[PDB]
Symmetry: C3
Subunit: 396 residues, 3 copies
């Protein structure tokens, strides 16, 4: 039956006017100009590849000094007086109250132990990658008709007589990677496969995180001990911060650079300047009547967003229930996408029958204000649906 999922052409090579087959750096453009005989001008322009990363913003990674202080007062109870470290942003406290052999002179009590972090200094911003999308802008002008589109990696553009396909194993960054920028985005980031998430301890990568909703403080896994002169508190645990431990071995981690980067709340956009990342590009110009666009179809698709579940800004994603009506075709195998005002975040291939169908699409990314709509090609539903906030909370 009919289907538009195949993005490509059927051709007779004998009838092909021109074929291009080359490898191009991701960071390179390409321009080709030849006059086609009848003279007909012909222009093929491919732009630099653009990386689109849906990111979770993690805030500022913090450096700090580890401190422990004892406070022994002979007065009654431990809670009745408070202690100097309790003004710190992050402190962990243990109180040895009404226990014993340990009384210093003049005291016939409370022994307050306190570990806290001060000299807090931001060392860079961190982002966790939800999804990655690689696109290139391609413009084709055959005579007086121009066609421009943004082509995804491993996808093809089909015009009445030109087919342009890209194929590239471009994938240095991975989803759920953690990007750390010690400076402005322009100066590049560091990829960290290890970054604390479910069990952030002091000294872990990402231990102290200054977020917009306040500070996020690491647990101290060491053990306390009361020494018995006035008692002194002792802590057996990690003293050195996660930042200092990473910088000491910093050259162990993978960097990645960014040219002209643009950033929003949930998305990072740049061009990778590494000229070694190459994809394969194939262009075929074939003006014969037998040059068939494989995606041609007389089918019509009506879209309505039925329901939504799941979260925005999540590597788990959201699930979008679509009501897809099909007319003018007995069946039609196609792709239905989840898109908002900005762009799309996921697609599902279904086999549609005459009449109404129900189609569920899993999207990944988006923000609080994204109104995700069911989309086909450039046709989306009239209405969109907001998703739930993502669960990204330390348990502490």
């Amino acid at each position: 039956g009919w289907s538009d999922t195949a993005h490509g052409v059927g051709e007779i090579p004998m009838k092909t006017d021109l074929e291009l087959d080359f490898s191009l750096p991701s960071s390179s453009s390409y321009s080709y100009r030849r006059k086609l005989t009848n003279s007909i001008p012909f222009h093929f322009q491919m732009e630099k590849q653009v990386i689109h990363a849906e990111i979770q913003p993690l805030g500022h990674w913090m450096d700090a000094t580890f401190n422990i202080k004892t406070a022994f007062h002979c007065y009654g109870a431990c809670q009745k007086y408070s202690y100097p470290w309790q003004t710190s942003k992050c402190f962990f406290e243990k109180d040895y109250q009404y226990e014993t052999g340990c009384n210093p002179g003049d005291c016939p009590g409370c022994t307050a132990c306190g570990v806290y972090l001060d000299k807090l200094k931001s060392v860079g911003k961190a982002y966790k990658i939800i999804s990655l999308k690689y696109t290139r802008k391609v413009c084709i002008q055959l005579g007086t008709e121009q066609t421009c589109k943004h082509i995804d990696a491993n996808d093809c553009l089909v015009t009445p007589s030109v087919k342009v396909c890209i194929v590239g194993t471009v994938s240095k960054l991975q989803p759920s990677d953690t990007l750390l920028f010690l400076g402005p985005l322009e100066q590049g980031g560091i990829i960290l496969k290890q970054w604390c998430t479910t069990s952030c301890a002091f000294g872990d990568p990402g231990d102290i995180m200054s977020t917009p909703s306040g500070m996020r403080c690491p647990e101290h896994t060491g053990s306390f001990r009361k020494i018995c002169t006035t008692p002194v508190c002792e802590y057996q645990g990690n003293t050195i911060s996660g930042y200092k431990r990473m910088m000491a071995t910093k050259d162990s981690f993978q960097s990645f650079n960014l040219t002209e980067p643009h950033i929003t709340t949930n998305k990072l956009e740049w061009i990778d300047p590494d000229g070694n990342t190459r994809d394969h590009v194939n262009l075929v110009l074939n003006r014969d009547v037998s040059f068939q666009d494989l995606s041609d179809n007389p089918c019509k698709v009506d879209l309505h967003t039925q329901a939504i579940e799941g979260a925005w800004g999540s590597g788990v994603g959201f699930t979008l229930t679509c009501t897809v009506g099909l007319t003018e075709c007995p069946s039609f195998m196609t792709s239905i996408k989840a898109c908002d005002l900005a762009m799309c975040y996921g697609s599902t291939v279904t086999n549609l029958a005459r009449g109404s169908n129900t189609v569920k699409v899993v999207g990944k990314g988006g923000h609080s204000g994204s109104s995700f709509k069911c989309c086909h090609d450039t046709d989306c539903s009239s209405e969109g649906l907001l998703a739930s906030a993502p669960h990204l909370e330390r348990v502490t």
Copy 2:
């Protein structure tokens, strides 16, 4: 010399009857029907891509409550009486016996500390990915001759006059990834790059694991302390379970969905419903006498499984020593595979000489009952060999 490792054709494009070049979603089929002139019917059917993951079954991940109880009895010795927590599936015990200042009234002893987990609830099944294989079923009918085969990704099918090649960077899942299904497989899983393996502590991802051979209990890394009234036990360590720590930040991890999934002891089979994963498909129909199958060869290959070492169900794999006899050809460069009744798990390219050769193939996956045989194309040895059980034991 001769060689069948190249899966493809040499053609004259002028003599090509038809060429198809398109990108297709992994989750999409494709059908093409054109009448070839002489009329000759021609049908090209490509099916959805099927993901084959050799998995290590890890059992049920468990949620639990952390408990600590003290038991002080004045009677002699600590071992002589046992304690209530010792019926729990997972408990860790420390006994302060015959030590000191700490005696409560009426006692002129044993102080039993016990941390244990109860309210154990299964929260999902977990699997570690050994290997990944992406296949598509392709059927070609030129006139009255039909050819169907399952093509691996980045491989080609060659018929007397048709060449079909697939090229796809399809690889979202990675080997040694950990898949967690909070529900039935149908409802999808979560990818976890961090999952405890060599040092499972309480609070780690995968801390409490209910396996078929019984329970697998996490270590508690905290420290004990006897407080001195009857003595009270104190524990400085993580109280919150790994499950609760992950759910609190669940939206941080990558999901993956599965359509019509099928599961065995060591293998998970499904179709990825994400329509954004696209591979490149190229078909060439060329009926000219100069259309040469590059893998054509008059060579004959005899197979015998010599020995085996290594383990089934292991990402390290097993090594299969093959005795490969070659006749009717001076040399022959080919691929020798390790396959069982179900399918194949690895292949090795060698350069064979006239007579007997020894060829070692590394396979990954399989199960206890798999009888791995040396195979060439569809020809395998008569006899197979069982492999060793995999070493997948916590040290505890």
Copy 3:
């Protein structure tokens, strides 16, 4: 304008003499011989793929036994006497001096605790992967003119009349992976995604590391306690070494084998014997005057290395400032590379104008003696620059 970044050709398929399109194992060669009519001999030889991994050498991973000893002497002070474990390569010490109820008989003192590791045995060498590069040697002989080059994956070779392109999702190993060889390289390695780097504790993968600059000892995160007869030291912490914990579950990790491997200080070179890794190969022989090499250009490029910053042997890399003069062309979009005597480590695509330009290239890898030069094609600067030593130190 002009550009040589596109490695490929523009052709008329009708005028094509011969086209090859096949998939080949990475571990396979290929040879094709046909006589071209006028007879003209034609030879196309493709060699096995070669993996080039820039590695950071980590030294010998060590197995050990965990020991704890108490030393109580009644004499004055703890420092005045030293203790037997202090000859061990790795020991961690805690001294309970001048504290209290605990005095054994004949003593009216010092209680020395000592945890140490002995029976140290090397269990294998470990390497962290900086970067990966996949190359194949390809030779083309059309009549009396031969052209040989080493082609990178996803790149094309262009001769006056032949175009050879490779496209392959070949990427089992990943950058910043950790390779462990329990034996000689020939016998294969194990990939470890978890390998301690910023917080190496006893029991972590890679806990005890014998490096050329001496030993690297793990921290012991447990807690000490003085028991009160002469006092006994107690340690609550992990007793079992990282090696023993991995071997107990060894079959959980991914292996990779190596044929004829060659190793230097900063680079590992081999051929992957897995015959399932396949890339796509396309050859086009087209001797028509319209067969245009897309990289043809009359431009000339002068090179001078301006400055360098960053480190050799680092997954973060070094930044190379190049002075690139352009003559004979108004503009020229090209690739400028960072290479030393051995090979290249990175490239940057720029748009050059008439006259002098400044171009910054990020390289990854190299060694202490590498003199990195700015390069274009096979033309490099006369002078090179040394980079800084990488920061790869445990904080301890």
